[PDB]
Amino acid sequence: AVQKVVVHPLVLLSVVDHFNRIGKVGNQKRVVGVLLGSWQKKVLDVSNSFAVPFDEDDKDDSVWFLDHDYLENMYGMFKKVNARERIVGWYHTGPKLHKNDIAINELMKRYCPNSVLVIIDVKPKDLGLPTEAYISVEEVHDDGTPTSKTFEHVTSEIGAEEAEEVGVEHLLRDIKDTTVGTLSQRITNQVHGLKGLNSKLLDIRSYLEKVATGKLPINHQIIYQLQDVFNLLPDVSLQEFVKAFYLKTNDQMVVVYLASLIRSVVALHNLINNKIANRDAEKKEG
């Protein structure tokens, strides 16, 4: 198991390039490539990637071609350029997995047994996290259900090593937000959080509707986990907490009040100092 697949900025900026390379002329769906990177305790580091000629057909959803020699030869070159990278998985920008993913993943299992596919939604630019990392597991589904290939999910997180970090920071250099936050940006951080929590809760509702209307299979698992989240709610109405909330809300207001007063006396002092300044210069003009 891979606890995390940290996708470095360079990969998602080559995939974007890879999507543009083709889609610009050969209008096509997902662009497939290989993902190189160094291993860690359990967190797979994605540090680079390259494209692999990939052609598919909407018919039979298994007439594809992921070149072997191009994949083999490319990596033959890259291990020369840098030797800390081993093939570790593949990437496709088609937002929704295909029926061809399992079979192709079996191929990339021929180059790295613990192969993780990272879906980069190059086209969308939205709430965030444009990478979704998947593994391959074949289990008996403990709870008495057919076996199958399936793609298990692995937590994805986007990070940066020092070198790319310097390039990225300059690369934006026109839309970066101040790190301090300030009251303006902190609040926007919350209207943003509220929008997400609603958005995540709405994806949950649609699925629950789907299972409710039958259109989807009752997982029987992860379904009650959502029931776990439904019991972990706070129940604020409790009196003993209601008292304890006013105390801390009151504990803070007396600091914003002291903060407010200091900013006021300073304000008046600054007007009195200024009223003297222009007045004194007023008389001194004569």
Binding site: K176, T178, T179, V180, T182
Partner: protein, 70 residues
Amino acid sequence: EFLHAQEEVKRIQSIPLVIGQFLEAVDQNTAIVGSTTGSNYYVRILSTIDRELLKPNASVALHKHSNALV
């Protein structure tokens, strides 16, 4: 810009940083610190730094490449 400006200045005190001794002072925002490397360098003084902690033996830190009192 001001917040970026302060952040950019705050970036100057990033690590790594060579260590040198505050030999003397020439004037406001400048110094005659002498690096641990073995050579004494006429460097600049970061404003945020306090001119009251620059005692004339102070083991101050100098920017690694630009070699300025930071």
